[PDB]
């Protein structure tokens, strides 16, 4: 029980090897899985056995029970579904070892191949009746019980233990790929095209973050890891790919939070001849149909304050509330910020309302980062009953967004927030090389615009944050398999 269980099971493998019994066989020819076994023999008669249809099935023993040395009860799991094993001495093929020698050797956690027939016990339990039982691979360690996990960080370290004990985690991850599959098929329906852009570049462009640094030995270059796929995707639209998208990982060297991770899955599409309204119409259709594709209703339950407090209802019914960033800030505080924002009359007009409201000052106090913290404390945690948009950002905050059609100083940028956390960022791209801020971003992108970029609108998604709200999870390490951990 302490640590000696790892020793005798290890010697048990050696005792089987010396006696001539190979403990890890090569191939077991199973003819039926467990989920299909459940679907095929679900409505059998209580006590009915199908003796003429023998089946070969595999699985992992999760409960070892006995009753008289000649009747042994097991729990065989596989692909998230569970059936019972009713090993009876009279049904055992008395030609491959003794019954006791064939069943006293296996314990909890062992992968075993079963040769038997389907049937239901008198208690009404669908079970497989093995005439032959062969150990495929033994579990040398002591597996914890049901509620002996999902507490410590052993899940984030050894996820294979968390996937075999808690039905939640398996449901968290089958819904994660269900989202990615729904998102991939959603774009393909609109004629989008999936591509692959490089991840090791000589410049860190696309967003605002802190990059990584690696080195190529055969070339002697110190390359930067990407933070987004903004620049290469636009170059492909110049190449004729009007509808293009890409799903993949992006790297960030920021602080690790419950919504922040060193690496996470990104998704950016770029729609040619699409304006500001085409994006919000695309966003409201995507999130609404997604939660309806999963839960059958636009209203979902989500414990915002951990599993210890009551949840809050998140309504995904379009249209979502649109909010202007500069217009809402100057109303809740009645501090009129006149453009230009990078002046000196207004840059401290908002400094005297961030330290006056007991909020951390962001250094450097640039007009772009001041409006960011002002929006993060006055607009973000506004509508938790339903997601909302923060639209019409200033041009100081979005150096890659096209000028607004009428309103000066602003742009057509939009950010969707769920429970106050950004999960979407979209704007109409700035296809003017002369009205650009950075070309006076690498030259590979500045030269790409000089060849002609159509009026394009882009959008980025946070899939790792989306799965958090769509699975009632509060941490970023719950929605990814192997999060970065400290030894």
Ligand X SMILES: N[C@@H](CCCC[NH3+])C(=O)O
Ligand Y SMILES: C[C@@H]1CCCN(C[C@H]2Cc3cc(O)cc(O)c3C(=O)O2)C1
Binding site for ligand X (CB under 6 A): 206-207, 228, 230, 268, 425-427, 458-460
Rounded Cα–Cα distance for residues 420 and 315 (Å):
14
Do 461 and 266 contact (CB within 8 A), yes or no? yes
Mapped to the 3 state alphabet, what secondary structure does 297-329 carry?
Answer: CCEEEECCCCCCCCCEEEECCCCCCEEEHHHHH
Output helix, strand, coil percentages for the chain, rounded to the nearest 5: 25, 25, 45
In the complex with ligand X, the residue whose CB is nearer, 251 or 427, is: 427
**Judged by CB under 8 A, does residue 238 bind its own copies?**
yes
**Judged by CB under 6 A, does residue 176 bind ligand Y?**
no
399 binds, among ligand Y, ligand X, its own copies, none (CB under 5 to 8 A by kind): none
**Lookup result for tokens 């989920």:** 35
Instruction: Tell me how far, at minimum, the Cβ of 393 lies from ligand Y, in Å.
Output: 13
**Judged by CB under 8 A, does residue 5 bind its own copies?**
no
Helical spans, DSSP H, in 159-299: 159-162, 167-189, 230-238, 276-295
**Judged by CB under 6 A, does residue 252 bind ligand Y?**
yes
Instruction: Tell me how far, at minimum, the Cβ of 239 lies from its own copies, in Å.
Output: 3
In the complex with ligand Y, the residue whose CB is nearer, 113 or 460, is: 460
Instruction: Tell me how far, at minimum, the Cβ of 48 lies from its own copies, in Å.
Output: 28
Q: Find the binder of its own copies among 37, 74, 186, 251 (CB under 8 A).
A: 251
Helical spans, DSSP H, in 142-166: 154-157, 159-162
Burial class (CB in 10 A: 0-12, 13-18, 19+), 98: exposed
Instruction: Tell me how far, at minimum, the Cβ of 21 lies from its own copies, in Å.
Output: 13
Instruction: Tell me how far, at minimum, the Cβ of 425 lies from ligand X, in Å.
Output: 4
In the complex with ligand Y, the residue whose CB is nearer, 75 or 263, is: 263
**Judged by CB under 8 A, does residue 221 bind its own copies?**
yes
Biggest CA–CA distance in the chain, Å, is: 93
The two beta strands, 243-251 and 213-216, are unpaired
- Which of these segments, 114-122, 304-312, 350-358, 477-485, binds its own copies (CB under 8 A)? 477-485
Structure tokens at 50: 């199908």
Distances (CA, A) of 220 to 203, 205, 217, 226: 16, 21, 5, 19
Beta-ladder partners of 75: 84
What number of other Cβ atoms are within 10 A of residue 211's Cβ?
16
147 binds, among its own copies, ligand X, ligand Y, none (CB under 5 to 8 A by kind): none
426 binds, among ligand Y, ligand X, its own copies, none (CB under 5 to 8 A by kind): ligand X
- Which of these segments, 239-247, 254-262, 294-302, 375-383, binds ligand Y (CB under 6 A)? 254-262
Instruction: Tell me how far, at minimum, the Cβ of 312 lies from its own copies, in Å.
Output: 28
Using DSSP, state whether 161 is helix, strand or coil.
Answer: helix
Binding residues among 417-476 for ligand Y as defined by CB under 6 A? 422-425, 460-462, 464-465, 476
Q: Which phi and psi (to 5°) does residue 470 adopt?
A: -90, 15
230 binds, among its own copies, ligand Y, ligand X, none (CB under 5 to 8 A by kind): ligand X
**Judged by CB under 6 A, does residue 201 bind ligand Y?**
no
Interacting residue ranges for ligand Y, rule: CB under 6 A = 228, 252, 254, 259-261, 264, 266, 422-425, 460-462, 464-465, 476
């Amino acid at each position: 029980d302490p640590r000696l269980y790892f020793e005798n099971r290890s010697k048990f493998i050696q005792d089987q090897k010396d006696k001539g019994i190979n403990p890890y066989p090569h191939k077991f020819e199973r003819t039926i899985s467990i989920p299909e076994f459940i679907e095929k023999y679900k409505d059998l008669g209580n006590g009915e056995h199908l003796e003429d249809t023998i089946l070969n099935i595999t699985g992992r023993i999760m409960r070892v029970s006995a009753s008289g040395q000649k009747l042994r009860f097991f729990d065989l799991v596989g692909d998230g579904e569970k059936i019972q094993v009713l090993a009876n001495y009279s049904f055992h093929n008395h030609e491959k070892g003794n019954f006791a020698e064939c069943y006293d050797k296996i314990r909890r956690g062992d992968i075993v191949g079963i040769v038997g027939f389907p049937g239901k016990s008198k208690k009404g339990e669908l079970s497989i009746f093995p005439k032959e039982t062969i150990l495929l691979s033994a579990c040398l360690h002591m597996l914890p019980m049901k509620y002996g996990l999902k507490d410590t960080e052993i899940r984030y370290r050894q996820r294979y233990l968390d996937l075999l004990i808690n039905e939640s985690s398996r449901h968290t991850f089958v819904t994660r790929t269900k989202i990615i599959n729904f998102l991939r098929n959603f774009l393909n329906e609109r004629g989008f095209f999936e591509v692959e852009t490089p991840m090791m570049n000589l410049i860190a462009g696309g967003a605002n973050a802190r990059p990584f640094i690696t080195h190529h030995n055969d070339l002697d270059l110190d390359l930067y890891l990407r933070i987004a796929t903004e620049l290469p995707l636009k170059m492909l639209i110049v190449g004729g790919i009007d509808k293009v998208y890409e799903i993949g990982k992006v790297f960030r060297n920021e602080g690790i939070d419950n919504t922040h991770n060193p690496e996470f899955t990104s998704c950016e599409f770029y729609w040619a001849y699409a304006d500001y309204n085409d994006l919000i119409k695309w966003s409201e259709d995507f999130f609404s149909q997604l939660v309806y594709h999963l839960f059958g209703t636009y209203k979902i339950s989500y414990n915002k304050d951990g599993p210890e407090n009551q949840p809050i209802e998140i309504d995904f019914t379009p249209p979502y509330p649109k909010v202007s960033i500069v217009e809402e800030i100057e109303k809740v505080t009645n501090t009129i910020l006149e453009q230009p924002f990078d002046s000196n009359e207004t840059i401290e007009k908002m400094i005297n309302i961030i330290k006056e409201h007991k909020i951390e000052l962001p250094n450097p106090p640039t007009a772009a980062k001041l409006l960011d913290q002002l929006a993060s404390h006055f607009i973000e945690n506004k509508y938790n009953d339903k997601p909302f948009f923060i639209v019409e950002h200033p041009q100081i905050m979005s150096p890659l967004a096209k000028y607004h059609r009428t309103k000066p100083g602003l742009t057509e940028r939009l950010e969707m927030f769920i429970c106050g956390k950004e999960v979407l960022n979209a704007y109409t791209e700035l296809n003017d090389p002369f009205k650009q801020k950075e070309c006076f971003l690498d030259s590979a992108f500045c030269t790409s615009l000089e060849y002609g970029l159509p009026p394009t609108g882009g959008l980025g998604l946070g899939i790792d944050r989306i799965t958090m709200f769509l699975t009632n999870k509060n941490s970023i390490k719950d929605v990814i398999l192997f999060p970065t951990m400290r030894p």
